Structure 1
Amino acid sequence: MNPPPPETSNPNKPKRQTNQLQYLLRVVLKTLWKHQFAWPFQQPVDAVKLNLPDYYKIIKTPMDMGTIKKRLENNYYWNAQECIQDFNTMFTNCYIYNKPGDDIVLMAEALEKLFLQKINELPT
């Protein structure tokens, strides 16, 4: 079975709008979302439908760009650091669960290279 997916809204979580967060949504997420390698990462990992039965025995902090996209669009975050941490978690899960040189790890590295490309231009 799959665990419950990460929340994308919470009536008890304080939130802000900042230029850094606008940048993360409009530049970083939108650029990675359209990438030809984005598709494994655009929704929570369905370990049943994808035939990764051990996935959630290993990965205890799931994250994906579909969740991140909705958190940004819903204004879930307080600061840019929280959003970067979610991206970092997504990539980490891929590198931890899969083995070095796995095709999916090669995909994640290309997306991560682009992610860092855009973060290097994050505004003040």
Structure 2
Amino acid sequence: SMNPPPPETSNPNKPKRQTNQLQYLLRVVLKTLWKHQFAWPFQQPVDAVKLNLPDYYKIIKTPMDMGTIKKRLENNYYWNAQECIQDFNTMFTNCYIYNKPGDDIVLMAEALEKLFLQKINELPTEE
């Protein structure tokens, strides 16, 4: 029933990098998703108290959302792009474990996984 604290967006002793792929990720890919008409249920952490889904965090052991992700981008939290790219995979994957296919929240996810996959087919180069 209670919510856990949100995944860390800061960490002083994690190694950090502003790689150019990575700033594509925040500047194009995240904001390409961030403003899609279905981004809202994902712009922050799932709230099992307001939604009254107590079972959520018993099922979902590694929450991700775009809220923490955008922060992590703005926090140079990442070492490269694979890291951030798999913070998206878990965001979706959680939605496909917790819910069952056909659910409206599954729809929107799938919609966003595909645009996300569209915007991360082409990524800029290195310096």
1:16-47 deviation digits (Å, cap 9, x = unpaired): 01110011000100100000000000101111
Tell me which residue corresponds to 1:23. Answer: 24
1:71-111 deviation digits (Å, cap 9, x = unpaired): 00111111101000101110000010001100100010111
Per-residue deviation at 1:123?
2.3
Per-residue deviation at 1:122?
1.7
TM-score, normalised by the number of residues in structure 2: 0.95
Equivalences, count: 124
Same amino acid, percent of matched pairs? 100
Instruction: Structure 2: give runs of 5+ residues left out of the alignment.
Output: none
Q: 2-side partners of 1:95 and 1:123: how far apart?
A: 30
Q: 2-side partners of 1:61 and 1:23: how far apart?
A: 25
Q: 1-side partners of 2:31 and 2:114: how far apart?
A: 15
Q: 2-side partners of 1:5 and 1:22: how far apart?
A: 23
The structure 1 segments of at least 4 consecutive aligned residues displaced by more than 2 Å after TM superposition are none
TM-score, normalised by the number of residues in structure 1: 0.98
CA RMSD in angstroms comes to 0.7
Instruction: Structure 1: give runs of 5+ residues left out of the alignment.
Output: none
